[PDB]
Design a protein around this ligand. Sequence first.
Ligand code: A1AY3
Ligand code: A1AY3
Ligand code: A1AY3
Ligand code: A1AY3
Length: 209
Amino acid sequence: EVETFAFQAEIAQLMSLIINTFYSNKEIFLRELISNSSDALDKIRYESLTDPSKLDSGKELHINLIPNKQDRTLTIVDTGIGMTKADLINNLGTIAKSGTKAFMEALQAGADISMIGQFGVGFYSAYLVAEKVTVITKHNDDEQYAWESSAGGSFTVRTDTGEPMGRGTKVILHLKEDQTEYLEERRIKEIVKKHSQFIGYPITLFVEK
Ligand SMILES: Brc1n[nH]c2cnccc12
Ligand SMILES: Brc1n[nH]c2cnccc12
Ligand SMILES: Brc1n[nH]c2cnccc12
Ligand SMILES: Brc1n[nH]c2cnccc12
């Protein structure tokens, strides 16, 4: 069972601007998704302060970066709080409509795309390098779900029959053909060290065969 939704017009306008505007500093996508993972990890840790059983789905709080050259995918895995089905449909738990409004007004007022994170819509920078994004997520209060979109004005949500996640979120970036540099080991370390050096969680860059 697959449900297909239309993006709100403002969100579809945001993704098309990200996809079509000439902008070379594409590496900021990783900082934004890592920052999102850190926020999700902060929340589940806070809830565990008064209810330790919230970590029964996994006590480890970490971020993994998994490149796969054969699939041409870069996967950002975290064990944060995760998202419910309603959160996924609700623009992945953000106020993306009002956040996009402020972002596009800043852009005409001198801003550039790299400041997208200060507006709560940093997730959509993933489409600087990915032609398709798959979000697998598991919240303690819901089942495991899969969110997917190749832009084009629509996204799908389905029950995920894949590997059970325990708790957290998996962001799978199906990279564009000319953006495979973000699967190289030394390129990812350089980006993590320059934009994410103060994330308060272990970031493990998986290596390949
Ligand atoms: Br948890 C969660 N849901 N949506 C988010 C967007 N940015 C950071 C964290 C989250
Ligand atoms: Br939106 C988003 N990007 N990365 C995440 C990790 N956990 C929850 C929500 C998100
Ligand atoms: Br943590 C978290 N849950 N939902 C969010 C939306 N924006 C930023 C951070 C979060
Ligand atoms: Br929870 C939550 N929903 N939306 C948010 C925005 N910023 C921080 C936390 C949240």
